[PDB]
Amino acid sequence: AQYEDGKQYTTLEKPVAGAPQVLEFFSFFCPHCYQFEEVLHISDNVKKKLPEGVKMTKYHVNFMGGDLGKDLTQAWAVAMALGVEDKVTVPLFEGVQKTQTIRSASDIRDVFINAGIKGEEYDAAWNSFVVKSLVAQQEKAAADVQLRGVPAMFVNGKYQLNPQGMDTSNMDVFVQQYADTVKYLSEK
């Protein structure tokens, strides 16, 4: 077949019930994740090809970057709670991987302040039990699929994208292959 298990995707032997339709995991410490965001715009290109009626979910993971890794998972919970993902994603990536100016929870906070989220509002969210449970949700989703690597994308709790199985001579062609695979898996 054109799309084959073990080629563009793998199938989870232990499927995950109730999982989000399109679920992406990333880390601000993750170099392919940086590429996926700034150079490839994977999430965006996937969304443009998904059917009417599907929501996309993106969660941060703990297993990279130790203490700062966890802080970032909490900050991403804050970003989801306040709905400011599209404002902090790039400066967090660049602060961690490019300028390396993010070294503490305070430095993460600075990114949000510079993005126009008020201090009061950030700190209130940071310490909120709504953010606690959003952190809990990120960890649980990752735990359910035994996640040891990012970037990762899962479709309907049953299929995992396999970007290693797609051509990388052309960045554009890779992105469309990725997105088309998501669509196909989606319709499966």
- And the tokens for 63? 């297993």
Rounded Cα distance, 102 and 108, in Å: 6
Rounded Cα distance, 168 and 67, in Å: 33
Give all domains of the chain, ordered by start, each with its CATH number: 1-188 (3.40.30.10)
- And the tokens for 20? 């989000």
Burial of 60 from C-beta contacts in 10 A (0-12 / 13-18 / 19+) = buried
164-173 contacts, C-beta under 8 A, 24 or more apart: 165/6, 165/7, 165/8, 166/8, 171/39, 171/40
Burial of 155 from C-beta contacts in 10 A (0-12 / 13-18 / 19+) = buried
Angle (deg, nearest 10), helices 66-82 and 105-114: 30
Which residues lie below 8 Å from residue 152, measured CB to CB, with a gap of 6+? 24, 25, 145, 160, 161
User: Is-contact 78 112, C-beta < 8 A?
Assistant: yes
Rounded Cα distance, 32 and 83, in Å: 24
Q: Technique behind this structure?
A: X-ray
- And the tokens for 184? 């196909």
Q: How far apart are the first and last CA of the chain?
A: 14
User: Is-contact 72 28, C-beta < 8 A?
Assistant: yes
User: Is-contact 46 182, C-beta < 8 A?
Assistant: yes
Which residues lie below 8 Å from residue 39, measured CB to CB, with a gap of 6+? 171
Rounded Cα distance, 37 and 178, in Å: 14
**146: Cα separation from own chain's centroid:** 16
User: Is-contact 92 71, C-beta < 8 A?
Assistant: no
Beta strands 9-11 and 56-60, pairing class: unpaired
Angle (deg, nearest 10), helices 85-93 and 66-82: 160
Q: Of 89, 58, 80, 83, whose CA–CA distance to 134 is shortest?
A: 80
